Design a binder for these strands. Structure first.
Ligand SMILES: [K+]
Ligand SMILES: [K+]
Ligand SMILES: [K+]
Ligand SMILES: [K+]
Ligand SMILES: [K+]
Ligand SMILES: [Mg+2]
Ligand SMILES: [Mg+2]
Ligand SMILES: [Mg+2]
Ligand SMILES: [Mg+2]
Ligand SMILES: [Mg+2]
Ligand SMILES: [Mg+2]
Ligand SMILES: [Mg+2]
Ligand SMILES: [Mg+2]
Ligand SMILES: [Mg+2]
Ligand SMILES: [Mg+2]
Ligand SMILES: [Mg+2]
Ligand SMILES: [Mg+2]
Ligand SMILES: [Mg+2]
Ligand SMILES: [Mg+2]
Ligand SMILES: [Mg+2]
Ligand SMILES: [Mg+2]
Ligand code: NA
Lengths: 72, 226, 118, 255
RNA sequence: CGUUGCUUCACUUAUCGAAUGAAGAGACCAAUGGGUUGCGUAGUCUUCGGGCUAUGCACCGUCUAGGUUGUGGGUACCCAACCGUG
RNA sequence: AAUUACCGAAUCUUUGAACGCAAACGGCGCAUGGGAGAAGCUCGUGUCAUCCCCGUGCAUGCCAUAUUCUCAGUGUCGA
RNA sequence: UUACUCUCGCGUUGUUCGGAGCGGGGGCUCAAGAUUGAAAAAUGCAUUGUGAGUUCUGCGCUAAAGCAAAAACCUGGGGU
RNA sequence: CACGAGUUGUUCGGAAACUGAGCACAACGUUAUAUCGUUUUGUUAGGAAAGUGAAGGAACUGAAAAGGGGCAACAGAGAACCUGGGAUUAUAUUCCAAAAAGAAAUUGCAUGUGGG
């Protein structure tokens, strides 16, 4: 990205103030990589935790029915 | 390919929809004051003279009385002009309207029934009329809204209406109405003159008191002998 | 009842009838053809003014001090049937406004000066 | 006579706060529904210095609870807070340095700062650098909490009031001698027009009760009544005692 | 029996302090409540139309999270009751 | 009558209570009615974008009014 | 990239830097200059090489003192 | 002292059009008396101060968005132009006329050409 003053920035082409990569002209290449990795890994941990909670509840209710059928 | 995409609306989580904020917004001053006035009037202790206007007549009797008044409503300007022109080339029997004329009718003991609105402001205009009617032994009723009386007689509002004479086609209706009115108002004079009003707690205070009584229950059982 | 979604009450939007045009309060008679005579007052004949006529095809006038360059161009066309390509103005130290008016090449300033009477 | 300087300062004029460089008031979050029932999580973005204040300030970013935007808060930073740290505020927040919790949820014997005297006041006690308050006890029947203040006094506050865990950053400031008049000049430049100080006995009788005389001396006792009018209440105001303190020092203030 | 002086305990509507862009109060978990915009019992009055004082039964008046009981695409409930209180 | 005297018809620049907004600025607006227009369009005419010029209305408060104008209120009713 | 194995290496006048990636090979980009030409000889008057000075710029950014704000403009995230 | 003359801008400075230390119109309150007080710590006033984007069949009609209207810097922010002249008695980055001595930059609105 070039360093342009007020009038120069307005009349210049869009290439000179940006980059084809995502968040171009706002974030550097290493900051983009950090956000991409963070988005995937944090979301994945939520999925693992979410499925763990449901199964623990799921296996708990099955035992109740099994205990119910055993008694009756 | 269509699927459901539910939104989580817990603390944090997704941005919620726009919920109703009527009960917590800042209203205009006159709105706030006209609500607080009713609250204060309920909370304070009301003397019998003011309290008597809170207890009103039954809906069916009110409807019958308004029907009779509308039947005997006074003439309009066009009707009066036409009648005057016809006689040129006395007004028919009607009700008595207007504070001065109604008061004169009551004082001269010409009225057979009196109807008084319960929401006149300032209230000093009609605060004494039930007492005057009781002293003269004249049947009277206190009904809801001066707007209904005004609509019955043909105007915007009306403070009081007096019935003095009625045809034979409605004499029996008038007698039944007099009986009902006397049952509600004139027979209960002692209770009306002795009964106070007000002293009403709010719903929140009532619920708080109930829960406090429920919580502090049975803690003194051990002090009872045997 | 109605539902409100903002924490404070604002004035509702109501119908507004537009205002009507009244009869004009000024009734003096004004003429359109007279206006150009007010803009241009009279020419100058000083030594500096005369040199510009021969060497720059330019005329010099005293004009209304509240007039602008655009109006002066139009008045010149309406009064003398010439086209002005450039107008420069200044306000003199005595309070009057002076204008150097350069004519187009199609016209001759000297010929126009003779018609005026310089 | 003429008006005394202490009374003249009450008009304002050239004796007001120099606040052009300041960043704004420092306060906690607004006590809202999320704070009363759950918790909110924010991120510390920067730690900065403000002219006239000895403690560091922190900028903390939260999400708006009702709209799509970000909210920035300026708070007094406890010691140890760092950029990128997560801050939890609310009823269900865990017990850690930097979090904001209701006083009823904090274990007895804990060290706190930025304490609300009244619920929703957004922090009024224990804010100067290096200061803190100590939790003494709870009363569940009355719903109140007892605190020991930096001055040594003890105060009872509603248990709904909030507090931040830790101590205020920047402690140890007053241990370094100043050594120069210019350093005091720069110190008070950021605060106000109150330095240097001229002694009362060095003035003339027209301006001060202590002025005048062929020697520099006060001719009457310097302890004055609580009922003295303005312009007469100078010196040691309503002093219970004077002189060097022997033995332990009592706790200052009213009963 | 009455009235009036001080007081201590409970309350909230005057008033005071604070905060907020007046941004989510309280209840539904039920009376020492309210209702003619209801039904009985016992007294006690009545201008005979019906009231008042105690006392019972209805109506206002209901909901709920959670807890207890070889790769791809899917299934794994309902109980009803207590605890809890959005 | 470039005489005088008096008076009924007229003109009356920028301001000022000054009142569209401001002001050591002959400055800047909204609505409406006009004017001029060497571009472009069209058959020396007509028409006209951007720019320019002129007239009128537009402060705050209060009173009356609306062939009966448009609305708000967990104020009081009613269906 | 066994670069710091047993005195590790690169670098400034200068107060230091490296497995959170030094040094070497090859590259991408920014800032300040240099060079070739159009302007431009048609103008002006009647030549291209070194030392000294010079705050534009670069060397990225005392303190209990830590160094204004906004209009205007630029880019992106979503959506069309 | 007398008479007669002289100051030329799309780009230079200001305004149109920024904000600062600050001021105080409206609003509210006070005073026998407004010629008094509050009025930037995001900000007036017990406080109903938003007047048009799209639309929808060519002018209408109304959704959205909390916190009234201004002023205060000719050294702060902002700002599209340069040289030559034999061009004055006195002005010039303001004057020069078809070989403009000439070479540029920029704003508004329209007409082709190309692409979509
Ligand atoms: K009311
Ligand atoms: K000083
Ligand atoms: K002395
Ligand atoms: K002395
Ligand atoms: K209503
Ligand atoms: Mg000029
Ligand atoms: Mg201040
Ligand atoms: Mg002396
Ligand atoms: Mg003295
Ligand atoms: Mg001495
Ligand atoms: Mg003394
Ligand atoms: Mg004006
Ligand atoms: Mg090494
Ligand atoms: Mg002289
Ligand atoms: Mg002279
Ligand atoms: Mg203030
Ligand atoms: Mg300011
Ligand atoms: Mg303001
Ligand atoms: Mg400047
Ligand atoms: Mg300029
Ligand atoms: Mg000179
Ligand atoms: Na500041």
């Amino acid at each position: 990205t070039k360093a342009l003053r007020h009038i120069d920035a307005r009349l210049a082409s869009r290439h000179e103030k940006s980059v084809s990569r995502a968040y171009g002209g706002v974030l550097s290449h290493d900051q983009v990589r950090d956000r991409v990795v963070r988005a995937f890994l944090v979301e994945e941990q939520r999925i693992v935790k979410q499925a763990l909670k449901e199964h623990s509840k799921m296996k708990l209710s099955h035992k109740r029915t099994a205990n119910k059928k055993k008694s009756k | 390919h269509f699927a459901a995409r539910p939104k989580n609306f817990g603390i944090g989580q997704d941005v919620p929809y726009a919920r109703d904020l009527s009960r917590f917004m800042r209203w205009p001053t006159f709105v706030t004051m006209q609500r607080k006035k009713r609250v204060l009037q309920r909370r304070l202790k009301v003397p019998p003279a003011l309290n008597q206007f809170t207890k009103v007549l039954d809906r069916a009797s009110r409807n019958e009385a308004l029907k009779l008044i509308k039947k005997y409503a006074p003439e309009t300007r066009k009707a009066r002009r036409e009648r005057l022109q016809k006689v040129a080339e006395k007004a028919p029997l009607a009700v008595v309207t207007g504070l001065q004329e109604v008061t004169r009718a009551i004082e001269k003991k010409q009225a057979r029934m009196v109807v008084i609105a319960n929401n006149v402001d300032p209230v000093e205009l009609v605060l004494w009329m039930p007492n005057l009617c009781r002293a003269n032994k004249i049947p009277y009723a206190i009904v809801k809204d001066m707007a209904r009386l005004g609509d019955a007689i043909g105007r915007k509002t009306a403070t009081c209406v007096a019935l003095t004479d009625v045809n034979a086609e409605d004499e029996a209706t008038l007698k039944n109405l007099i009986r009902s009115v006397n049952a509600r108002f004139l027979s209960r004079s002692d209770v009306i003159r002795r009964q106070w009003g007000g002293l009403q707690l709010s719903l929140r205070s009532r619920a708080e008191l109930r829960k406090k009584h429920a919580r502090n229950a049975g803690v003194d059982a051990a002090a009872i002998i045997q | 009842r109605k539902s409100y979604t903002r924490p404070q009450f604002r004035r509702p939007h109501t119908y507004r009838k537009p205002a009507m045009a009244k009869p004009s309060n000024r009734v003096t008679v004004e003429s359109k053809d007279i206006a150009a005579f007010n803009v241009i007052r009279y020419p100058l004949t000083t030594d500096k003014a005369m040199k510009k006529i021969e060497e720059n095809n330019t005329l010099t006038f005293i004009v209304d001090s509240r007039a602008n360059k655009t109006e002066i161009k139009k008045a010149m066309r309406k009064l003398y049937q010439v086209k002005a390509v450039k107008v420069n103005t200044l306000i003199r130290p005595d309070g009057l406004k002076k204008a150097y008016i350069r004519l187009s090449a199609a016209h001759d300033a000297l010929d126009t000066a003779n018609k005026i009477g310089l | 006579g003429k008006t005394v300087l202490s009374c003249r300062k009450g008009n304002g004029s050239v004796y007001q706060v120099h606040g052009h460089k300041r960043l704004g008031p420092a306060k906690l979050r607004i006590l809202d529904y999320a704070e009363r029932h759950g918790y909110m999580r924010g991120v510390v973005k920067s730690i900065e210095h403000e002219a006239g204040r000895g403690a560091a300030l922190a900028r903390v970013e939260f999400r708006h609870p009702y709209k799509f935007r970000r909210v920035k808060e300026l708070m007094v930073a406890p010691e140890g807070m760092f950029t990128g740290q997560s801050v939890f505020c609310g009823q269900k927040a865990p017990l850690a340095i930097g979090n904001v919790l209701p006083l009823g949820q904090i274990t007895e014997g804990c060290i706190v700062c930025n304490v609300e005297a009244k619920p929703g006041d957004r922090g009024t006690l224990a804010r100067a650098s290096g200061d803190y308050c100590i939790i003494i006890s709870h009363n569940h029947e009355t719903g109140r909490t007892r605190l020991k203040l930096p001055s040594g006094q003890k105060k009872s506050v509603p248990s709904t009031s909030r507090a931040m865990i830790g101590i205020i950053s920047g402690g140890g400031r007053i241990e370094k001698p100043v050594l120069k008049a210019g350093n005091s000049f720069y110190r008070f430049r950021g605060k106000r027009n109150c330095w240097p100080k001229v002694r009362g006995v060095a003035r003339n009788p027209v301006e001060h009760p202590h002025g005048g005389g062929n020697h520099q001396h006060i001719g009457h006792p310097s302890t004055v009544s609580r009922h003295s009018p303005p312009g007469q209440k100078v010196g040691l105001i309503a002093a219970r005692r004077t002189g060097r303190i022997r033995g332990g020092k009592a706790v200052k203030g009213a009963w």
